[PDB]
Enzyme design. Sequence first.
Site, PDB file in Angstrom:
ATOM      1  N   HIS A   1       0.821  -1.213   0.000  1.00 20.97           N
ATOM      2  CA  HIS A   1       0.000   0.000   0.000  1.00 20.97           C
ATOM      3  C   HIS A   1       0.856   1.264   0.000  1.00 20.97           C
ATOM      4  CE1 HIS A   1       0.653  -1.088   4.261  1.00 20.97           C
ATOM      5  NE2 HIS A   1       0.747   0.216   4.457  1.00 20.97           N
TER       6      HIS A   1
ATOM      7  N   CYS B   1      -8.732  -9.219   5.158  1.00 15.94           N
ATOM      8  CA  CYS B   1      -8.662  -7.755   5.230  1.00 15.94           C
ATOM      9  C   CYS B   1     -10.048  -7.165   5.446  1.00 15.94           C
ATOM     10  CB  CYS B   1      -8.059  -7.169   3.965  1.00 15.94           C
ATOM     11  SG  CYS B   1      -7.719  -5.395   4.168  1.00 15.94           S
TER      12      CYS B   1
ATOM     13  N   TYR C   1      -3.671   3.823   1.983  1.00 18.83           N
ATOM     14  CA  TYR C   1      -4.653   3.369   0.991  1.00 18.83           C
ATOM     15  C   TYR C   1      -3.946   2.394   0.069  1.00 18.83           C
ATOM     16  CZ  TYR C   1      -7.462   7.047   2.914  1.00 18.83           C
ATOM     17  OH  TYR C   1      -8.160   7.833   3.802  1.00 18.83           O
ATOM     18  N   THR C   2      -4.703   1.441  -0.456  1.00 19.24           N
ATOM     19  CA  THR C   2      -4.132   0.313  -1.177  1.00 19.24           C
ATOM     20  C   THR C   2      -4.513   0.450  -2.629  1.00 19.24           C
ATOM     21  OG1 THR C   2      -4.525  -1.003   0.802  1.00 19.24           O
ATOM     22  CG2 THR C   2      -4.032  -2.192  -1.246  1.00 19.24           C
TER      23      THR C   2
HETATM   24  C1  LIG Z   1      -2.790  -0.882   5.592  1.00 19.29           C
HETATM   25  C2  LIG Z   1      -4.137  -0.181   5.354  1.00 19.29           C
HETATM   26  C3  LIG Z   1      -4.613   0.054   4.060  1.00 19.29           C
HETATM   27  C4  LIG Z   1      -5.881   0.711   3.884  1.00 19.29           C
HETATM   28  N1  LIG Z   1      -6.319   0.878   2.570  1.00 19.29           N
HETATM   29  C5  LIG Z   1      -7.579   1.458   2.410  1.00 19.29           C
HETATM   30  C6  LIG Z   1      -8.166   1.593   1.092  1.00 19.29           C
HETATM   31  O1  LIG Z   1      -7.534   1.096  -0.025  1.00 19.29           O
HETATM   32  N2  LIG Z   1      -9.364   2.177   0.917  1.00 19.29           N
HETATM   33  C7  LIG Z   1     -10.000   2.669   2.014  1.00 19.29           C
HETATM   34  O2  LIG Z   1     -11.186   3.278   1.857  1.00 19.29           O
HETATM   35  N3  LIG Z   1      -9.505   2.571   3.259  1.00 19.29           N
HETATM   36  C8  LIG Z   1      -8.283   1.976   3.483  1.00 19.29           C
HETATM   37  N4  LIG Z   1      -7.849   1.852   4.774  1.00 19.29           N
HETATM   38  C9  LIG Z   1      -8.406   2.769   5.783  1.00 19.29           C
HETATM   39  C10 LIG Z   1      -7.841   4.183   5.735  1.00 19.29           C
HETATM   40  O3  LIG Z   1      -6.485   4.195   6.029  1.00 19.29           O
HETATM   41  C11 LIG Z   1      -8.533   5.105   6.722  1.00 19.29           C
HETATM   42  O4  LIG Z   1      -8.530   4.508   7.962  1.00 19.29           O
HETATM   43  C12 LIG Z   1      -9.963   5.473   6.283  1.00 19.29           C
HETATM   44  O5  LIG Z   1      -9.945   6.076   5.039  1.00 19.29           O
HETATM   45  C13 LIG Z   1     -10.593   6.442   7.276  1.00 19.29           C
HETATM   46  O6  LIG Z   1      -9.761   7.533   7.512  1.00 19.29           O
HETATM   47  P1  LIG Z   1     -10.401   8.911   7.862  1.00 19.29           P
HETATM   48  O7  LIG Z   1      -9.283   9.890   8.047  1.00 19.29           O
HETATM   49  O8  LIG Z   1     -11.305   9.400   6.766  1.00 19.29           O
HETATM   50  O9  LIG Z   1     -11.255   8.653   9.141  1.00 19.29           O
HETATM   51  P2  LIG Z   1     -10.857   8.929  10.642  1.00 19.29           P
HETATM   52  O10 LIG Z   1     -11.060  10.392  11.005  1.00 19.29           O
HETATM   53  O11 LIG Z   1      -9.472   8.565  10.998  1.00 19.29           O
HETATM   54  O12 LIG Z   1     -11.724   7.993  11.549  1.00 19.29           O
HETATM   55  C14 LIG Z   1     -13.083   7.891  11.435  1.00 19.29           C
HETATM   56  C15 LIG Z   1     -13.539   6.515  11.771  1.00 19.29           C
HETATM   57  O13 LIG Z   1     -14.753   6.597  12.429  1.00 19.29           O
HETATM   58  C16 LIG Z   1     -15.676   5.862  11.697  1.00 19.29           C
HETATM   59  N5  LIG Z   1     -16.596   6.727  10.990  1.00 19.29           N
HETATM   60  C17 LIG Z   1     -16.535   8.074  10.863  1.00 19.29           C
HETATM   61  N6  LIG Z   1     -17.587   8.483  10.138  1.00 19.29           N
HETATM   62  C18 LIG Z   1     -18.347   7.340   9.791  1.00 19.29           C
HETATM   63  C19 LIG Z   1     -19.552   7.120   9.030  1.00 19.29           C
HETATM   64  N7  LIG Z   1     -20.229   8.183   8.438  1.00 19.29           N
HETATM   65  N8  LIG Z   1     -20.030   5.851   8.878  1.00 19.29           N
HETATM   66  C20 LIG Z   1     -19.393   4.810   9.436  1.00 19.29           C
HETATM   67  N9  LIG Z   1     -18.249   4.965  10.155  1.00 19.29           N
HETATM   68  C21 LIG Z   1     -17.724   6.248  10.334  1.00 19.29           C
HETATM   69  C22 LIG Z   1     -14.855   5.007  10.767  1.00 19.29           C
HETATM   70  O14 LIG Z   1     -14.487   3.833  11.425  1.00 19.29           O
HETATM   71  C23 LIG Z   1     -13.731   5.777  10.532  1.00 19.29           C
HETATM   72  O15 LIG Z   1     -12.555   4.985  10.274  1.00 19.29           O
HETATM   73  C24 LIG Z   1      -6.631   1.139   4.956  1.00 19.29           C
HETATM   74  C25 LIG Z   1      -6.123   0.886   6.283  1.00 19.29           C
HETATM   75  C26 LIG Z   1      -4.911   0.242   6.449  1.00 19.29           C
HETATM   76  C27 LIG Z   1      -4.415   0.004   7.891  1.00 19.29           C
HETATM   77  N1  LIG Z   2      -4.998  -3.339   6.671  1.00 17.25           N
HETATM   78  C1  LIG Z   2      -5.310  -3.110   5.289  1.00 17.25           C
HETATM   79  O1  LIG Z   2      -4.487  -3.353   4.415  1.00 17.25           O
HETATM   80  C2  LIG Z   2      -6.652  -2.580   4.893  1.00 17.25           C
HETATM   81  C3  LIG Z   2      -6.962  -2.265   3.560  1.00 17.25           C
HETATM   82  C4  LIG Z   2      -8.266  -1.779   3.252  1.00 17.25           C
HETATM   83  C5  LIG Z   2      -9.199  -1.656   4.305  1.00 17.25           C
HETATM   84  N2  LIG Z   2      -8.858  -1.994   5.566  1.00 17.25           N
HETATM   85  C6  LIG Z   2      -9.920  -1.828   6.685  1.00 17.25           C
HETATM   86  O2  LIG Z   2     -11.126  -2.472   6.346  1.00 17.25           O
HETATM   87  C7  LIG Z   2     -12.184  -1.754   7.020  1.00 17.25           C
HETATM   88  C8  LIG Z   2     -13.201  -1.406   6.055  1.00 17.25           C
HETATM   89  O3  LIG Z   2     -14.252  -0.717   6.657  1.00 17.25           O
HETATM   90  P1  LIG Z   2     -15.671  -0.556   6.005  1.00 17.25           P
HETATM   91  O4  LIG Z   2     -16.194   0.788   6.515  1.00 17.25           O
HETATM   92  O5  LIG Z   2     -15.617  -0.541   4.511  1.00 17.25           O
HETATM   93  O6  LIG Z   2     -16.471  -1.798   6.617  1.00 17.25           O
HETATM   94  P2  LIG Z   2     -17.975  -1.913   7.005  1.00 17.25           P
HETATM   95  O7  LIG Z   2     -18.240  -1.169   8.257  1.00 17.25           O
HETATM   96  O8  LIG Z   2     -18.890  -1.418   5.913  1.00 17.25           O
HETATM   97  O9  LIG Z   2     -18.129  -3.452   7.330  1.00 17.25           O
HETATM   98  C9  LIG Z   2     -17.931  -4.382   6.318  1.00 17.25           C
HETATM   99  C10 LIG Z   2     -18.087  -5.782   6.761  1.00 17.25           C
HETATM  100  O10 LIG Z   2     -17.219  -5.999   7.820  1.00 17.25           O
HETATM  101  C11 LIG Z   2     -17.798  -6.884   8.715  1.00 17.25           C
HETATM  102  N3  LIG Z   2     -17.876  -6.287  10.035  1.00 17.25           N
HETATM  103  C12 LIG Z   2     -18.020  -4.995  10.373  1.00 17.25           C
HETATM  104  N4  LIG Z   2     -18.087  -4.884  11.724  1.00 17.25           N
HETATM  105  C13 LIG Z   2     -17.996  -6.154  12.248  1.00 17.25           C
HETATM  106  C14 LIG Z   2     -18.016  -6.689  13.560  1.00 17.25           C
HETATM  107  N5  LIG Z   2     -18.153  -5.795  14.699  1.00 17.25           N
HETATM  108  N6  LIG Z   2     -17.908  -8.054  13.740  1.00 17.25           N
HETATM  109  C15 LIG Z   2     -17.784  -8.882  12.671  1.00 17.25           C
HETATM  110  N7  LIG Z   2     -17.765  -8.416  11.424  1.00 17.25           N
HETATM  111  C16 LIG Z   2     -17.871  -7.039  11.182  1.00 17.25           C
HETATM  112  C17 LIG Z   2     -19.164  -7.127   8.209  1.00 17.25           C
HETATM  113  O11 LIG Z   2     -19.188  -8.354   7.480  1.00 17.25           O
HETATM  114  C18 LIG Z   2     -19.410  -6.026   7.376  1.00 17.25           C
HETATM  115  O12 LIG Z   2     -20.406  -6.262   6.422  1.00 17.25           O
HETATM  116  C19 LIG Z   2     -11.562  -0.611   7.755  1.00 17.25           C
HETATM  117  O13 LIG Z   2     -11.373  -0.935   9.069  1.00 17.25           O
HETATM  118  C20 LIG Z   2     -10.269  -0.430   7.073  1.00 17.25           C
HETATM  119  O14 LIG Z   2      -9.263   0.117   7.873  1.00 17.25           O
HETATM  120  C21 LIG Z   2      -7.634  -2.448   5.900  1.00 17.25           C
END
Ligand SMILES: Cc1cc2nc3c(=O)[nH]c(=O)nc-3n(C[C@H](O)[C@H](O)[C@H](O)COP(=O)(O)OP(=O)(O)OC[C@H]3O[C@@H](n4cnc5c(N)ncnc54)[C@H](O)[C@@H]3O)c2cc1C
Ligand SMILES: NC(=O)c1ccc[n+]([C@@H]2O[C@H](COP(=O)([O-])OP(=O)(O)OC[C@H]3O[C@@H](n4cnc5c(N)ncnc54)[C@H](O)[C@@H]3O)[C@@H](O)[C@H]2O)c1
EC number: 1.6.2.2
Length: 271
Positions: A48, A244, A64-65
């Site tokens: 990533h 993931c 981001y990936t």
């Molecule tokens: C190694 C790695 C790779 C990743 N690659 C990707 C990728 O390719 N694409 C991608 O989209 N993300 C990816 N993520 C997640 C990304 O890095 C961020 O964590 C994500 O985009 C949120 O960051 P933020 O600054 O917008 O939110 P932040 O301000 O840091 O935190 C907000 C958090 O509160 C929650 N939240 C806030 N508002 C809402 C809402 N309206 N509905 C539901 N939950 C909410 C979410 O959990 C959210 O993460 C990756 C994470 C890791 C560790």
């Molecule tokens: N480490 C990485 O390389 C990498 C890359 C991309 C995304 N991510 C992570 O993937 C997540 C994506 O979030 P999103 O907002 O798209 O997901 P989301 O909230 O829409 O949830 C997606 C699915 O995750 C599962 N899930 C969510 N909460 C759960 C719980 N409490 N118990 C069991 N299953 C649960 C469910 O099957 C759900 O449908 C983030 O946490 C992000 O950081 C990590």
Amino acid sequence: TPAITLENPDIKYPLRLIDKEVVNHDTRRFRFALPSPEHILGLPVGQHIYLSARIDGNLVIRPYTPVSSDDDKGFVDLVIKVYFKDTHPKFPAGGKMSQYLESMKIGDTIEFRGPNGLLVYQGKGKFAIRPDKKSSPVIKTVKSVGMIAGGTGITPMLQVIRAIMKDPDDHTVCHLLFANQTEKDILLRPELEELRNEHSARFKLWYTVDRAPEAWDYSQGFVNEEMIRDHLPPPEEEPLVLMCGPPPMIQYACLPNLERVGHPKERCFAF
Ligand SMILES: Cc1cc2nc3c(=O)[nH]c(=O)nc-3n(C[C@H](O)[C@H](O)[C@H](O)COP(=O)(O)OP(=O)(O)OC[C@H]3O[C@@H](n4cnc5c(N)ncnc54)[C@H](O)[C@@H]3O)c2cc1C
Ligand SMILES: NC(=O)c1ccc[n+]([C@@H]2O[C@H](COP(=O)([O-])OP(=O)(O)OC[C@H]3O[C@@H](n4cnc5c(N)ncnc54)[C@H](O)[C@@H]3O)[C@@H](O)[C@H]2O)c1
């Protein structure tokens, strides 16, 4: 050989946003231009990047990936979910970086750095996986790979899937179990179903959704033991299992059920 963009992982490279495409109600594909149309990103498959900016007076860095590859000259594609403010009662402020990105105009720039990550897919079933950031990669070659993705967790999986399908001599079989909250939340469904249509011998596809629509032919609920048993290769075939998604998906839905089915910890990797 093409010029590489990311030459040092500590250097920041400002890239210009050139296109944005809606993936669904909250997710988009963001395409950024590389420094020239002849450049490649410099991205081992499975790794990533990090974006960084000063947002509302604070340093914000997020990984981001990319879903693109070093075959793609002149651009990099990210697929990013926007966490909107005033939407989720538990997070009224929404997400910092994702909303900043959503607000960017075509032509605006943001700094990229990378690549990073403990897994590199080296082709033909061969994975180089470091136990941690301070250790040497262990090279693991398999005939099949299970992939469990939740939400945007699809992104590293799609990198690997695309890399495999491009090589007709790569006979690795990918079994993807992709979990999302609802049918409309299924990201990149057309892309995934095109891959299934074109490569069904090497790509097995299954969905689960938290909440299912009336006419649903796949699974419903959080990832469970039955889905892992039915939609990933059996432990006897010693596949790698890649995961993931949200941390509780990994901790509570994946790990305990992989144990129940019989996939050893050594065969498992969480991005
Ligand atoms: C190694 C790695 C790779 C990743 N690659 C990707 C990728 O390719 N694409 C991608 O989209 N993300 C990816 N993520 C997640 C990304 O890095 C961020 O964590 C994500 O985009 C949120 O960051 P933020 O600054 O917008 O939110 P932040 O301000 O840091 O935190 C907000 C958090 O509160 C929650 N939240 C806030 N508002 C809402 C809402 N309206 N509905 C539901 N939950 C909410 C979410 O959990 C959210 O993460 C990756 C994470 C890791 C560790
Ligand atoms: N480490 C990485 O390389 C990498 C890359 C991309 C995304 N991510 C992570 O993937 C997540 C994506 O979030 P999103 O907002 O798209 O997901 P989301 O909230 O829409 O949830 C997606 C699915 O995750 C599962 N899930 C969510 N909460 C759960 C719980 N409490 N118990 C069991 N299953 C649960 C469910 O099957 C759900 O449908 C983030 O946490 C992000 O950081 C990590």
